[PDB]
């Protein structure tokens, strides 16, 4: 075969993972992105902790295919986003360490480090990194759903699909889960399943 990677997948730091008090008061609020970034330009590109965009290079420039969370040396994202492909961050290569297809989850440089928690009734913030947009924190109340084998919490699919991988956070600032894990419900709707929220 070839010794070059099939695709140029670059990470781009976008925001601190933390609970945003302004979004708790207003329902939503922008987050600072650094010099202050007034606008996000998807097509240009621009590891320690935070929320990252995942951008694929093509002839027309970069496309945001997803997002993810770096924590304690491990990058966390959605399986469907990278399909296990090797990632780059500023010339440093990151390799897949672990994956669960049914959860639509994958991590790079270690196992799952996400420790956010959620119990029915509590509110979370999606720290949305959408294609073309500065980071925005949006308060939401997850609903509880039955599996199949137990329970999961879920949020509504209210962001661009390229937002997949974006951290959803609790009041402690810990990541309960990632946006974009589309599952089908009993009554015909699709929602975003959180996990860590999973019990069985």
From TrEMBL:
Signal sequence coordinates: none
Catalytic residue positions: 80, 104, 164
Residue stretches making up the Peptidase S7 domain: 47-200
UniProt-annotated location(s): Host endoplasmic reticulum membrane; Host mitochondrion; Host nucleus; Secreted
Entry superkingdom: Viruses
Described function: Regulates the ATPase activity of the NS3 helicase activity. NS4A allows NS3 helicase to conserve energy during unwinding. Plays a role in the inhibition of the host innate immune response. Interacts with host MAVS and thereby prevents the interaction between RIGI and MAVS. In turn, IFN-beta production is impaired. Interacts with host AUP1 which mediates induction of lipophagy in host cells and facilitates production of virus progeny particles.
Binding partners and assembly: Homodimer; in the endoplasmic reticulum and Golgi. Interacts with protein prM. Interacts with non-structural protein 1.
Name used for this protein in its record: Genome polyprotein
Organism of derivation: Dengue virus type 2
